Write an enzyme that holds these catalytic residues in place. Structure first.
Site, short mmCIF file in Angstrom:
data_model
loop_
_atom_site.label_atom_id
_atom_site.label_comp_id
_atom_site.label_asym_id
_atom_site.label_seq_id
_atom_site.Cartn_x
_atom_site.Cartn_y
_atom_site.Cartn_z
N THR A 115 0.83 -1.19 0.00
CA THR A 115 0.00 0.00 0.00
C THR A 115 0.87 1.25 0.00
O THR A 115 0.75 2.10 -0.88
CB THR A 115 -0.93 0.04 1.22
OG1 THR A 115 -1.70 -1.16 1.29
CG2 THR A 115 -1.86 1.25 1.16
N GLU B 237 9.04 26.86 -0.28
CA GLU B 237 10.33 27.30 0.22
C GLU B 237 11.24 26.12 0.55
O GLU B 237 12.47 26.24 0.49
CB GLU B 237 10.13 28.19 1.45
CG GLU B 237 11.39 28.92 1.88
CD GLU B 237 11.12 30.02 2.89
OE1 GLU B 237 10.06 30.68 2.79
OE2 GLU B 237 11.96 30.23 3.78
N1 LIG Z 1 9.02 3.16 11.42
C1 LIG Z 1 7.95 2.41 11.19
N2 LIG Z 1 7.96 1.50 10.15
C2 LIG Z 1 6.88 0.74 9.91
C3 LIG Z 1 5.75 0.85 10.71
N3 LIG Z 1 4.83 -0.03 10.24
C4 LIG Z 1 5.36 -0.68 9.18
N4 LIG Z 1 6.63 -0.23 8.98
C5 LIG Z 1 7.55 -0.65 7.91
O1 LIG Z 1 6.81 -0.77 6.71
C6 LIG Z 1 7.28 -1.85 5.94
C7 LIG Z 1 6.09 -2.70 5.51
O2 LIG Z 1 5.11 -1.83 5.01
P1 LIG Z 1 3.73 -1.52 5.78
O3 LIG Z 1 3.52 -0.04 5.94
O4 LIG Z 1 3.69 -2.22 7.11
O5 LIG Z 1 2.65 -2.20 4.80
P2 LIG Z 1 1.40 -1.42 4.15
O6 LIG Z 1 1.73 0.01 3.78
O7 LIG Z 1 0.23 -1.49 5.10
O8 LIG Z 1 1.11 -2.22 2.79
P3 LIG Z 1 0.45 -3.69 2.73
O9 LIG Z 1 0.16 -4.21 4.12
O10 LIG Z 1 1.38 -4.61 1.99
O11 LIG Z 1 -0.85 -3.57 1.97
C8 LIG Z 1 8.26 -2.63 6.80
O12 LIG Z 1 9.56 -2.46 6.29
C9 LIG Z 1 8.14 -2.03 8.18
O13 LIG Z 1 9.40 -1.98 8.81
C10 LIG Z 1 5.73 1.75 11.76
O14 LIG Z 1 4.74 1.86 12.47
N5 LIG Z 1 6.84 2.53 12.00
#
Ligand SMILES: Nc1nc2c(ncn2[C@@H]2O[C@H](COP(=O)(O)OP(=O)(O)OP(=O)(O)O)[C@@H](O)[C@H]2O)c(=O)[nH]1
Ligand SMILES: Nc1ncnc2c1ncn2[C@@H]1O[C@H](COP(=O)(O)OP(=O)(O)CP(=O)(O)O)[C@@H](O)[C@H]1O
Ligand SMILES: Nc1nc2c(ncn2[C@@H]2O[C@H](COP(=O)(O)OP(=O)(O)O)[C@@H](O)[C@H]2O)c(=O)[nH]1
Ligand SMILES: CCCCNc1cc2c(cn1)[nH]c1ccccc12
Ligand SMILES: [Ca+2]
Ligand SMILES: [Mg+2]
Ligand SMILES: [Mg+2]
Lengths: 54, 334, 427, 437
Positions: free
Chosen positions: D145, D254
């Site tokens: 996503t 900016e």
């Molecule tokens: N820093 C941080 N990284 C996150 C967090 N949640 C997920 N990630 C990172 O995001 C990556 C995976 O993508 P996600 O954002 O979890 O997945 P998504 O955007 O929901 O997409 P799908 O679930 O595949 O549909 C991984 O590398 C995680 O380390 C968070 O709350 N904080």
């Protein structure tokens, strides 16, 4: 060295210091891109249902 | 049980190191592109420093200092000395040199070239060797790449018997803590031909490279005089030692060069660590003044000293970081 | 995130029954269907496998299939026999007689539509169906033959849904009949095409474990199923309990399956424990890690050192230092990086759940996608050829309409699977 | 006054958005019910904080934000969170099935079924704007996503809002906290498709945030809550100039002017200090010189790399707390003589400084300690290209074997888009090298 553009207010202040001077796609094309990929799925799903039909 | 990789096969030095490490039975060699390594014996060109220290649960080390090429390139070394206040344009142990590009600082070189001739003082320079500027000012253009012009030492110290020219090669190791270790065993890469002031076009008499020479092997085996002999010669012929007359200047120049670039290459607080072996090349004039000729980033050792040096590299630069289950180095303190 | 469970045949229903027996105990569900736990963690992700019914009663989203009523009548009179929705008992009377053809083409065809009605009935209630799972053997007739027929027809009505299987592989050490290599080869052809994940449960491995390791002179099918129920509980822990891992079956499959045909996993479990024999000494993390990677703990009789791991998944359970887990996981890889492909960065992933299984303070489940699984198929292919070169026992099949050509094809497709595995082993 | 709309996409984007809006509320004195006592202009106004908050006649202050995920469980924690009253139902958009860490699935398949809806919900906000500057888009590189649907959204916003600017807060994939293995594919893909549609992007390597939490906060293994709270502080520093009175970085335009001379190279490196543990019983407060000097320590960067072996194009210093111009210039002069800071020949060697007297606000019960003064440096250095190199290498390794590729092709994507994107990244790495050496 040279401090310039100094702006001050109640919340804080800002400035710039210099140490040394110098020396898109359209809605059309997108909606077709998304549909050309939907046709590739429908085709892949078809060749599956045809394969399963055999 | 640590792990390492090898990405430079032409390395005479680290080829021996890779063998010593395996012989301990506490190291493993992986493949060229296996990222899960503790140590990396990387390539000379385009070494991917940007991919080090990003493997979780792996202390990573490499046998090269990123940015250390500024010291190991002739065009860069001149710029490094002139631009850096640490060394300054008035640097006394580096020949007066100038950067010249092919068709920069050309007009400045000619300005110094004149009064050199218009002052009743010797004037010979090197890129080849000539007394006339215009001679090889067109040479450098007909080669293609950038060169450096610098004052040729017309009054070199001369080894008797033979009346011969020579150059000193010192091997310096810088560990992950930027401790500067000078290898006690150096070597004089001598010329077997008598030095000749009259004609520079012949270079066997002016150049002391290891391959050019191959009167070879007459005086010393393979045209390589070690310190024990060269020291004894100085004591008998000049009533002085090697430490006093020359080595103090060598230890000074080495430390001065590396201290200058320490803040630019140090891996003290980095996510990956570096060490590196250097080869400094010095030149001695008749007045026992040492001059810096160049610095080699990928030096090759002398056969006798391979075993001892390569073992030293493992002791202080690798096992210091990856410990296992009277020192051949002089530490240059700062 | 609802999953639909199906269990076909004698084997499929017996491991399947014990599976529900185990996880129903983990989720605090009793033989009647009432919750009686100490935590809300047990009910948080419980919609995945259970349907919430009247009286706050939980009913497994399970479908019990067979061609004879023998085994399913035993399930119904079993411990948790009454938890199952009686309508989901779909059975014939004739049996399949360990005949793949009977399960796939004749006897099973007559019954398969009845099963799909129940599948559809469950799938419709699902808020968001994430996939199906099947438990069955491949050496019999029903589970093997009809199970793969079901999978084919499910992929027809649900082409965009995950299909996973827990497939018991036949072995001469633990053999009902001689035609097991025949039924297995025919089935593997089906699994290569129509499943996203197949957990290869070799009866050879389960036997050797029970014998060579677990101090059991003569293990029964019950002893073999203790290991299977333990493993099945292990791999579904992340799906059943809240944790760091936010993954449905699809996302899980994406990160494990680099190539569509190569989705046959080696399951593992630590510590290995026999029925009844209690565990007094809790394992340290270095021991869990060392054991779950040792071949003796593998449930597919393959040597990991004869191949390379494409991807690995590990599920630690219990109260432990996940810092120590990371270190020990990162350790193994760095000790033996030669047995992991270098062209899939970071192919070893780990997850932790705070609730351990019954009887153990902490445990680890291993899911390996190794190329060494070819040794399993090569074994079946040999036993297959040994009979097929003489066309032995083939009349049982040609009598049900099959041609020799279909055997030649199945043989070829599996030998292709083997060579495909060998391709990535030499990369 | 000109409004800014924040778009949080995917799990990472949403959960980080929550950390940020939580922090904003505390800084502006806004309560969980949306009431802001200090705001005397009831039902409206055009103050600096109104850039991020709209107002209702009932006196509620509502974030100009839209949350979007293809899967509800994460945004559901917002619907029932401590700040549930703050947001409006139509600001929270959820699907049923996620993209399973598949770019193609988030972009093409599922993205298509929800793109028109989000745009409509975004348009609902833009209609409440007297003068929209642009959008702040939070997301991950790794998620299907956060990568897939984001690039699709970014493409459209450039059509429906051609003039408006668009900034990015991007979570760069780190194995230590990641369970996925295909994130390198998703990262290269979304970067390629988004590059021409993003004016300025702040990357954050979870690897760096992770180690900062271990090294400086003494947290043995950081959770997302640990990472996100620390990330919100950095984001807050960067957006402070949009929410508070000042003359530096007052609009999104900016940010491009001051940090992005070349359009393609729009990935400034952020460096933040001091990060101090709340459990640190005795702490000697750090001076302007000390915290400014820390801005050139790689261990404090959002992305681990070596600026010494690169060239700067721009550098902003954003201070929060007890700081005055005098001490800053003193610190800069001192640091300059001791550290390697090479600019490109066609840029002046200088710093734009911004100071907000209000010290950094900390989440009660959080891991961060209150400090007298803090700073965030925004430097556009070519050294950040190392992160592209790492990512591109991992891509090449997998793609050479076409591993996992069938998952994307099965969603309607073409194998050629992999090589197109990779080619675009090869160009980007080269652009960085033209400038950098
Ligand atoms: N820093 C941080 N990284 C996150 C967090 N949640 C997920 N990630 C990172 O995001 C990556 C995976 O993508 P996600 O954002 O979890 O997945 P998504 O955007 O929901 O997409 P799908 O679930 O595949 O549909 C991984 O590398 C995680 O380390 C968070 O709350 N904080
Ligand atoms: N300014 C100078 N005066 C006198 N001799 C010089 C000189 N510059 C170079 N030489 C001679 O040139 C020889 C080799 O030149 P130089 O060392 O600069 O090139 P090089 O790098 O190919 C050999 P190496 O890298 O091993 O030192 C030296 O051995 C030295 O005798
Ligand atoms: N582990 C295990 N394997 C079984 C069990 N029953 C049968 N098998 C195996 O499955 C094969 C026989 O298949 P079976 O399930 O009896 O055939 P079906 O009932 O017609 O599907 C043989 O290889 C057996 O070793 C069981 O209860 N447990
Ligand atoms: C019935 C379906 C069983 C579950 N399948 C599954 C589980 C995991 C996986 C792939 N598939 N990758 C993982 C990584 C970490 C933890 C768990 C898993
Ligand atoms: Ca107001
Ligand atoms: Mg049977
Ligand atoms: Mg998600």
């Amino acid at each position: 060295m040279e401090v310039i553009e100094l702006n001050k207010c109640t919340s804080g202040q800002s400035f710039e210091v210099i140490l040394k001077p110098p020396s898109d796609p359209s809605l059309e094309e997108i909606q077709k891109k998304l549909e050309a990929a939907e046709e590739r799925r429908k085709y892949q799903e078809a060749e599956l249902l045809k394969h399963l039909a055999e | 049980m640590y792990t390492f990789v090898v990405r430079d096969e032409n390395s005479s030095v680290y080829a021996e190191v890779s063998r010593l490490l395996l012989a301990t039975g506490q190291w493993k060699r992986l493949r060229k592109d296996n990222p899960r390594f503790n140590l990396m014996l990387g390539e000379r060109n385009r070494l991917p420093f940007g991919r080090l220290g990003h493997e979780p649960g792996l202390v990573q080390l490499v046998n090269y200092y990123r940015g250390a090429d500024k010291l190991c390139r002739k065009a860069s070394l001149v710029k490094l000395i002139k631009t850096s206040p640490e060394l300054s344009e008035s640097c006394t142990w580096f020949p007066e040199s100038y950067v010249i590009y092919p068709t920069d600082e050309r007009e400045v070189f000619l300005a110094a070239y004149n009064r050199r001739r218009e002052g009743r003082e010797g004037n010979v320079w090197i890129a080849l060797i000539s007394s006339e500027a215009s001679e090889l000012l067109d040479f450098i253009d007909e080669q293609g790449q950038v060169h450096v012009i610098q004052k040729y030492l017309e009054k070199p110290l001369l080894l008797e018997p033979g009346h011969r020219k020579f150059d000193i090669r010192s091997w310096v190791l810088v560990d992950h803590l930027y401790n500067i270790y000078l290898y006690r065993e150096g070597v004089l890469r001598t010329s077997s031909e008598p030095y000749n002031s009259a004609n520079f076009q012949d270079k066997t008499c002016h150049l002391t490279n290891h391959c050019i020479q191959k009167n070879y092997g007459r005086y010393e085996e393979g045209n390589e005089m070690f310190f024990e002999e060269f020291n004894q010669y100085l004591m008998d012929a000049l009533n002085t030692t090697l430490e006093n007359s020359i080595l103090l200047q060598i230890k000074h120049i080495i430390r001065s060069c590396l201290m200058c670039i320490e803040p630019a290459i140090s891996t003290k607080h980095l996510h990956y660590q570096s060490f590196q072996l250097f080869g400094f090349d010095f030149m001695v004039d008749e007045e026992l003044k040492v001059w810096l000729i160049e610095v080699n980033g990928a030096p090759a050792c002398a056969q006798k000293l391979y075993a001892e040096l390569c073992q030293g590299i493992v002791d202080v630069a690798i096992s210091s970081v990856f410990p296992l289950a009277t020192s051949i180095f002089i530490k240059l303190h700062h | 995130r609802e999953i639909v469970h199906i269990q076909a045949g004698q084997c499929g229903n017996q491991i399947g029954a014990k599976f529900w027996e185990v996880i129903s105990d983990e989720h605090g569900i009793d033989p009647t269907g009432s919750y009686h736990g100490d935590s809300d963690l047990q009910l948080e992700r419980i919609n995945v496998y259970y349907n919430e019914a009247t009286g706050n009663k939980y009913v497994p989203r399970a479908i019990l299939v067979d061609l004879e009523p023998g085994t399913m009548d035993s399930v119904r009179s079993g411990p948790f026999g009454q938890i199952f929705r009686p309508d989901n008992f779909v059975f014939g009377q004739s049996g399949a007689g360990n005949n793949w053809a009977k399960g796939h083409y004749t006897e099973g065809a007559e019954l398969v539509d009845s099963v799909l009605d129940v599948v559809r009935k469950e799938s419709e209630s699902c808020d968001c169906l994430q996939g199906f799972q099947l438990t069955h053997s491949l050496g019999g007739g029903t589970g093997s033959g009809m199970g793969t027929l079901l999978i084919s027809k499910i992929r027809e009505e649900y082409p965009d849904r995950i299909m996973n299987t827990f497939s018991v592989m036949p072995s001469p050490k633990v053999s009902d009949t001689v035609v097991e290599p025949y039924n297995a080869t025919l089935s593997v052809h089906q699994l290569v095409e129509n499943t996203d994940e197949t957990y290869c449960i070799d009866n050879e491995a389960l036997y050797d474990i029970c014998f060579r390791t677990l101090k059991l002179t003569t293990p029964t099918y019950g002893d073999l199923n203790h290991l299977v129920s333990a493993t099945m509980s292990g791999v579904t822990t992340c799906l059943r309990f809240p944790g760091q891992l936010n993954a449905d079956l699809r996302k899980l499959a994406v990160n494990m399956v680099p190539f569509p045909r190569l989705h046959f996993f080696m399951p593992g479990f630590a510590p290995l424990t026999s029925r009844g024999s209690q565990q007094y000494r809790a394992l340290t993390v270095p021991e869990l890690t060392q054991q779950m990677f040792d071949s003796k703990n593998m449930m597919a009789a393959c040597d990991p050192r004869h191949g390379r791991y494409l991807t690995v998944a590990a599920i630690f359970r219990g109260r432990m230092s996940m810092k120590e887990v990371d270190e020990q996981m990162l350790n193994v890889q760095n000790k033996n990086s030669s047995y992991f492909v270098e062209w899939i960065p970071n192919n070893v992933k780990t997850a932790v759940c705070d609730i351990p299984p019954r009887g153990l303070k902490m445990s680890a489940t291993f899911i390996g996608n190794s190329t060494a699984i070819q040794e399993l198929f090569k074994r079946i292919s040999e036993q297959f050829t040994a009979m097929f070169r003489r066309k032995a026992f083939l009349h049982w099949y040609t009598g049900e309409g099959m041609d020799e050509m279909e055997f030649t094809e199945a043989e070829s497709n599996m030998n292709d699977l083997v060579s495909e595995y060998q391709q990535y082993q030499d990369a | 006054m000109r409004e800014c709309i924040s778009i949080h996409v995917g799990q990472a984007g949403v959960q980080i958005g929550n950390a940020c809006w939580e922090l904003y509320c505390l800084e502006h004195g806004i309560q969980p019910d949306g009431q802001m006592p200090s705001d005397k202009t009831i039902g409206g106004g055009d103050d600096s904080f109104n850039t991020f908050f709209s107002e209702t006649g009932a006196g509620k202050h509502v974030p100009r934000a839209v949350f979007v995920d293809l899967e509800p469980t994460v945004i559901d924690e917002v619907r029932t969170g401590t700040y549930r009253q703050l947001f409006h139902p139509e600001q929270l958009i959820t699907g049923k099935e996620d993209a399973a860490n598949n770019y193609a699935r988030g972009h093409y398949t599922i993205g298509k079924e929800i793109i028109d809806l989000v745009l409509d919900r975004i348009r609902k906000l833009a209609d409440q704007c007297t003068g929209l500057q642009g959008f702040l888009v939070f997301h991950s590189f790794g998620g299907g996503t956060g990568s897939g649907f984001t690039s699709l959204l970014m493409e459209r916003l450039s059509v429906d809002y051609g003039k408006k600017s668009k900034l990015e807060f991007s979570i760069y994939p780190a194995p230590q906290v990641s369970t996925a293995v295909v994130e390198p594919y998703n990262s290269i893909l979304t970067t390629h498709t988004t590059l021409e549609h993003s004016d300025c992007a702040f990357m954050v390597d979870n690897e760096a945030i992770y180690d900062i939490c271990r090294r400086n906060l003494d947290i043995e293994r950081p959770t997302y809550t640990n990472l996100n709270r620390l990330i919100s502080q950095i984001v807050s520093s960067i957006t402070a100039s949009l929410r508070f009175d000042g003359a530096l970085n007052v609009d999104l335009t900016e940010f491009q002017t001051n940090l992005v001379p070349y359009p393609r190279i729009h990935f400034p490196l952020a460096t933040y200090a001091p990060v101090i543990s709340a459990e640190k019983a005795y702490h000697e407060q750090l001076s302007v010189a000390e915290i400014t000097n820390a801005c050139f320590e790689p261990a404090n960067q959002m992305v681990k790399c070596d600026p010494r072996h690169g060239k700067y194009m721009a550098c902003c210093l954003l201070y929060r707390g007890d700081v005055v111009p005098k001490d800053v210039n003193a610190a800069i002069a001192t640091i300059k003589t001791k550290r390697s800071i090479q600019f490109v020949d066609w840029c002046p060697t200088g710093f734009k400084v911004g100071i907000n007297y209000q010290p950094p606000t900390v989440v009660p019960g959080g891991d961060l300690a209150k400090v007298q003064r803090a700073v965030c440096m925004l430097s556009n250095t070519t050294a950040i290209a190392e992160a592209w190199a790492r990512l591109d290498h991992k891509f090449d390794l997998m793609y050479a074997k076409r591993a996992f590729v069938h998952w994307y092709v099965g969603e309607g994507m073409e194998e050629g888009e992999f090589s197109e994107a990779r080619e675009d990244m090869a160009a980007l790495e080269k652009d960085y090298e033209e400038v950098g050496v």
